[PDB]
Design an enzyme around this catalytic site. Structure first.
Site, PDB file in Angstrom:
ATOM      1  CE1 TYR A   1     -22.993 -17.735 -22.180  1.00 55.19           C
ATOM      2  CE2 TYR A   1     -20.571 -18.019 -22.216  1.00 55.19           C
ATOM      3  CZ  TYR A   1     -21.861 -18.555 -22.241  1.00 55.19           C
ATOM      4  OH  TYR A   1     -22.003 -19.853 -22.539  1.00 55.19           O
ATOM      5  CB  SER A   2     -17.939 -10.988 -18.301  1.00 55.06           C
ATOM      6  OG  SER A   2     -17.860 -11.959 -17.313  1.00 55.06           O
TER       7      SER A   2
ATOM      8  CB  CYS B   1     -12.826 -11.605 -13.801  1.00 50.45           C
ATOM      9  SG  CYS B   1     -14.288 -12.211 -14.646  1.00 50.45           S
TER      10      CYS B   1
ATOM     11  CD  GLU C   1     -18.177 -11.932 -13.422  1.00 50.10           C
ATOM     12  OE1 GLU C   1     -18.784 -10.827 -13.171  1.00 50.10           O
ATOM     13  OE2 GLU C   1     -17.943 -12.337 -14.553  1.00 50.10           O
TER      14      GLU C   1
ATOM     15  CE1 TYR D   1     -15.676 -18.033 -16.407  1.00 50.30           C
ATOM     16  CE2 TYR D   1     -16.045 -15.916 -15.298  1.00 50.30           C
ATOM     17  CZ  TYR D   1     -15.480 -16.654 -16.340  1.00 50.30           C
ATOM     18  OH  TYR D   1     -14.793 -16.063 -17.368  1.00 50.30           O
TER      19      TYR D   1
HETATM   20  C1  LIG Z   1     -20.826 -14.639 -13.804  1.00 50.51           C
HETATM   21  C2  LIG Z   1     -20.296 -15.490 -14.891  1.00 50.51           C
HETATM   22  C3  LIG Z   1     -19.703 -14.936 -16.004  1.00 50.51           C
HETATM   23  C4  LIG Z   1     -19.181 -15.772 -16.964  1.00 50.51           C
HETATM   24  C5  LIG Z   1     -19.502 -17.161 -16.907  1.00 50.51           C
HETATM   25  C6  LIG Z   1     -20.195 -17.711 -15.837  1.00 50.51           C
HETATM   26  C7  LIG Z   1     -20.599 -16.867 -14.842  1.00 50.51           C
HETATM   27  C8  LIG Z   1     -21.342 -17.415 -13.667  1.00 50.51           C
HETATM   28  N1  LIG Z   1     -18.983 -17.967 -17.865  1.00 50.51           N
HETATM   29  C9  LIG Z   1     -19.278 -19.413 -17.897  1.00 50.51           C
HETATM   30  C10 LIG Z   1     -20.593 -19.681 -18.758  1.00 50.51           C
HETATM   31  O1  LIG Z   1     -21.709 -19.101 -18.068  1.00 50.51           O
HETATM   32  C11 LIG Z   1     -20.919 -21.173 -18.984  1.00 50.51           C
HETATM   33  O2  LIG Z   1     -21.001 -21.892 -17.729  1.00 50.51           O
HETATM   34  C12 LIG Z   1     -19.952 -21.859 -19.946  1.00 50.51           C
HETATM   35  O3  LIG Z   1     -19.911 -21.143 -21.206  1.00 50.51           O
HETATM   36  C13 LIG Z   1     -20.334 -23.349 -20.180  1.00 50.51           C
HETATM   37  O4  LIG Z   1     -21.765 -23.425 -20.527  1.00 50.51           O
HETATM   38  P1  LIG Z   1     -22.273 -24.456 -21.677  1.00 50.51           P
HETATM   39  O5  LIG Z   1     -23.780 -24.236 -21.687  1.00 50.51           O
HETATM   40  O6  LIG Z   1     -21.413 -24.446 -22.940  1.00 50.51           O
HETATM   41  O7  LIG Z   1     -22.000 -25.820 -20.783  1.00 50.51           O
HETATM   42  P2  LIG Z   1     -23.122 -26.855 -20.139  1.00 50.51           P
HETATM   43  O8  LIG Z   1     -23.891 -26.080 -19.160  1.00 50.51           O
HETATM   44  O9  LIG Z   1     -23.689 -27.629 -21.318  1.00 50.51           O
HETATM   45  O10 LIG Z   1     -22.075 -27.891 -19.436  1.00 50.51           O
HETATM   46  C14 LIG Z   1     -21.550 -27.382 -18.192  1.00 50.51           C
HETATM   47  C15 LIG Z   1     -21.224 -28.587 -17.379  1.00 50.51           C
HETATM   48  O11 LIG Z   1     -20.036 -29.115 -18.004  1.00 50.51           O
HETATM   49  C16 LIG Z   1     -19.541 -30.108 -17.033  1.00 50.51           C
HETATM   50  N2  LIG Z   1     -18.073 -30.126 -17.096  1.00 50.51           N
HETATM   51  C17 LIG Z   1     -17.166 -29.081 -17.396  1.00 50.51           C
HETATM   52  N3  LIG Z   1     -15.916 -29.540 -17.476  1.00 50.51           N
HETATM   53  C18 LIG Z   1     -16.036 -30.888 -17.215  1.00 50.51           C
HETATM   54  C19 LIG Z   1     -15.059 -31.942 -17.116  1.00 50.51           C
HETATM   55  N4  LIG Z   1     -13.780 -31.731 -17.301  1.00 50.51           N
HETATM   56  N5  LIG Z   1     -15.562 -33.183 -16.815  1.00 50.51           N
HETATM   57  C20 LIG Z   1     -16.896 -33.423 -16.616  1.00 50.51           C
HETATM   58  N6  LIG Z   1     -17.840 -32.512 -16.674  1.00 50.51           N
HETATM   59  C21 LIG Z   1     -17.358 -31.290 -16.978  1.00 50.51           C
HETATM   60  C22 LIG Z   1     -20.079 -29.761 -15.680  1.00 50.51           C
HETATM   61  O12 LIG Z   1     -21.070 -30.765 -15.406  1.00 50.51           O
HETATM   62  C23 LIG Z   1     -20.760 -28.396 -15.940  1.00 50.51           C
HETATM   63  O13 LIG Z   1     -21.765 -28.034 -15.035  1.00 50.51           O
HETATM   64  C24 LIG Z   1     -18.306 -17.444 -18.914  1.00 50.51           C
HETATM   65  N7  LIG Z   1     -17.857 -18.286 -19.776  1.00 50.51           N
HETATM   66  C25 LIG Z   1     -17.193 -17.836 -20.851  1.00 50.51           C
HETATM   67  O14 LIG Z   1     -16.760 -18.612 -21.695  1.00 50.51           O
HETATM   68  N8  LIG Z   1     -16.914 -16.456 -20.944  1.00 50.51           N
HETATM   69  C26 LIG Z   1     -17.337 -15.542 -20.058  1.00 50.51           C
HETATM   70  O15 LIG Z   1     -17.199 -14.393 -20.252  1.00 50.51           O
HETATM   71  C27 LIG Z   1     -18.136 -16.037 -18.952  1.00 50.51           C
HETATM   72  N9  LIG Z   1     -18.529 -15.204 -18.024  1.00 50.51           N
END
Ligand SMILES: Cc1cc2c(cc1C)N(C[C@H](O)[C@H](O)[C@H](O)COP(=O)(O)OP(=O)(O)OC[C@H]1O[C@@H](n3cnc4c(N)ncnc43)[C@H](O)[C@@H]1O)c1[nH]c(=O)[nH]c(=O)c1N2
Ligand SMILES: Nc1ncnc2c1ncn2[C@@H]1O[C@H](COP(=O)(O)O)[C@@H](O)[C@H]1OP(=O)(O)O
EC number: 1.18.1.2
Length: 296
Positions: free
Chosen positions: A77-78, A254, A294, A296
């Site tokens: 999370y950022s 981002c 960045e 995602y």
């Molecule tokens: C560098 C960086 C920084 C950030 C983030 C990522 C990264 C890499 N994220 C995203 C965060 O890390 C995370 O991926 C999300 O909160 C979702 O995680 P959960 O564990 O809730 O989903 P979980 O991991 O349980 O489910 C994720 C899966 O959902 C599935 N999916 C999503 N949409 C779908 C659809 N329409 N149909 C079918 N499948 C679908 C995919 O299979 C996906 O891999 C983020 N997030 C955030 O909210 N705020 C932030 O500040 C950040 N910052």
């Protein structure tokens, strides 16, 4: 060597096998009932143990086990708060999190693991964190830089971080005097994240801060096209292009992976008009540390 505030940063002070356990202070829904989906701003105590800098991320290990009886994988999370934090004492950290909800292959509704764990947190609850992580999104050392910030949804988080440092804080060795221009893409007016904060900054530093919103579901351009961030950018094409030609301009982007392409779609055409290949130009910017991403 680096043009960014890379000196003395901490990275992975805390790791997944040994996370820092902090507690929830506040957890508030920041979008309106109207909005498509929910976004929450939450703040956790870390008592000063996580020495992060603006632009970094933390990992969250949601509680429970995976299907193999193992602890869940971390999600990143950022960080949405400046290094001092929303309380200005350097002992808290804030996140901006969208609640993820989807339907699987069978029409069944699925909740994202970490996102719902986090959005459901109550003050007092504990949470496992790791990090800090990242160098990509750190601020430039130049206090007089032009900084353009392109965010979609939660991708506003690091920018909030930057901006609190820049405009809501007094620092012994840092005084921003450049131009900060933020573009923020959200779906509805009830999803304009931290707008009230940005409006206060704009009043404080009218000459130093520019702000543009791209409310996708409520706004259309002249052709009646959907107001994506790139859509709103084009309306400033000439200006932005010109800014990009200067050595003291830094771009940060981002949010949704998808925004990257749209932007490239507008840039290709802008540059070609000057006889520049956007792909090579961008590669040069990336190398000079002027184009930072960045998604995602
Ligand atoms: C560098 C960086 C920084 C950030 C983030 C990522 C990264 C890499 N994220 C995203 C965060 O890390 C995370 O991926 C999300 O909160 C979702 O995680 P959960 O564990 O809730 O989903 P979980 O991991 O349980 O489910 C994720 C899966 O959902 C599935 N999916 C999503 N949409 C779908 C659809 N329409 N149909 C079918 N499948 C679908 C995919 O299979 C996906 O891999 C983020 N997030 C955030 O909210 N705020 C932030 O500040 C950040 N910052
Ligand atoms: N590929 C894309 N390029 C630019 N903006 C996008 C892209 N896909 C979605 N968006 C917009 O990013 C924002 C994400 O904010 P949020 O997380 O609250 O949904 C919305 O305004 C969404 O518009 P829309 O959903 O109307 O297509």
């Amino acid at each position: 060597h680096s043009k960014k505030m890379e000196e003395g940063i901490t990275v992975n002070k805390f790791k997944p096998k040994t996370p820092y356990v902090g507690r929830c202070l506040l957890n508030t829904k920041i979008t309106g009932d109207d909005a498509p989906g929910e976004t929450w701003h939450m703040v956790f105590s870390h008592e000063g143990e996580i020495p992060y800098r603006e632009g970094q991320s933390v990992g969250v290990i949601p509680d429970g086990e995976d299907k193999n009886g193992k602890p869940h994988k971390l999600r990143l999370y950022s960080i949405a708060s400046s290094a001092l934090g929303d309380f200005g004492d350097a002992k808290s950290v804030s996140l901006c999190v969208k609640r993820l909800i989807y339907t699987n292959d069978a029409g069944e509704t699925i909740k994202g693991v970490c996102s719902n764990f986090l959005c459901d947190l109550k003050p007092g609850a504990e949470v496992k964190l790791t990090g800090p992580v990242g160098k990509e999104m750190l601020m430039p050392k130049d206090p007089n830089a032009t900084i353009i910030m392109l965010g979609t949804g939660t991708g506003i988080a690091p920018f909030r971080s930057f901006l609190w440092k820049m405009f809501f804080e007094k620092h012994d060795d840092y005084k921003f005097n450049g131009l900060a221009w933020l573009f923020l893409g959200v779906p509805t007016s009830s999803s304009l994240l931290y707008k009230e904060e940005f409006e206060k900054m704009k009043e404080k530093a009218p000459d130093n801060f520019r702000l543009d919103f791209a409310v996708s579901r409520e706004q259309t351009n002249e052709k009646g096209e959907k107001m994506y961030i790139q859509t709103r950018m084009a309306q400033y094409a000439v200006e932005l292009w010109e800014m990009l030609k200067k050595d003291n301009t830094y771009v940060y982007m981002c949010g949704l992976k998808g925004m990257e392409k749209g932007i490239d779609d507008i840039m290709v055409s802008l540059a070609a008009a000057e006889g520049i290949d956007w792909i090579e130009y961008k590669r040069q910017l990336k190398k000079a540390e002027q184009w930072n991403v960045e998604v995602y």
